[PDB]
Design a protein around this ligand. Structure first.
Ligand SMILES: CC(C)CCC[C@@H](C)[C@H]1CC[C@H]2[C@@H]3CC=C4C[C@@H](OC(=O)CCC(=O)O)CC[C@]4(C)[C@H]3CC[C@]12C
Ligand SMILES: CC(C)CCC[C@@H](C)[C@H]1CC[C@H]2[C@@H]3CC=C4C[C@@H](OC(=O)CCC(=O)O)CC[C@]4(C)[C@H]3CC[C@]12C
Lengths: 100, 100
């Protein structure tokens, strides 16, 4: 579930104002992921001033502060090994002509 | 709600042709966000020639004119501090060997 958040999922209906109407079990059957811990009031116990900025920090980091970082580290690589990749490709160009 | 618009939410059902069928209260209970201001005709009062290009300007800026800007400012940093980061990493490489 945090893996799908990198392509955009953002805790779709577990992070507040989404009650126990569906998606959850309380038991362990069926294969739905089990419910939020509850109380005598049958209220969701998670504080929601913590889980909501936790997701928003994670959705900031891995979707923006991380992927967009990967472009810069990709962008330096094409800046640096480009004049070397021509010699490397011309080197392996021999083996592909050698094959016949 | 504008924070989720950076990862793609785009005012899902408040920006027109989505009436008071659900999601809203008129009162202050329950925890649903309260309704659009209405009229004697019970029509949504917001002009919708203003709120729709306001979101589309915001969705243009923070999702494209802003994040893609961050890649360029990331891309200049890996272009500039790369030859300095080698000396910095080789410098802190001493303390990690010093630890034993
Ligand atoms: C710096 C920027 C770029 C990051 C944006 C951070 C927000 C996405 C986070 C930080 C604090 C969060 C709020 C902190 C706690 C509240 C109360 C919370 O409801 C309660 O806990 C009820 C408590 C009570 O009022 O008695 C619901 C979420 C909410 C509005 C959060 C909404 C989203 C917020 C604004
Ligand atoms: C320059 C490009 C890249 C930005 C694209 C801008 C559009 C996303 C915006 C600018 C003007 C907008 C329109 C301006 C006002 C109308 C009428 C509005 O309906 C009414 O207000 C009824 C008024 C009436 O006809 O009596 C509904 C949205 C709509 C179609 C908007 C649809 C989206 C639009 C085209």
């Amino acid at each position: 579930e945090p893996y799908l958040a990198m392509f955009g999922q953002y805790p779709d209906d577990i992070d507040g104002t989404t009650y126990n109407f569906d998606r959850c079990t309380f038991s362990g059957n069926e294969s739905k992921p089990l419910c939020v811990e509850l109380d005598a009031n049958n209220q969701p116990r998670f504080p929601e001033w913590i889980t909501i900025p936790l997701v928003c920090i994670y959705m900031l980091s891995t979707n923006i502060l991380l992927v967009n970082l990967l472009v810069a580290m990709f962008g330096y690589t094409v800046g640096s090994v480009q004049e070397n990749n021509d010699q490397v490709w011309k080197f392996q160009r021999f083996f592909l002509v050698q094959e016949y």
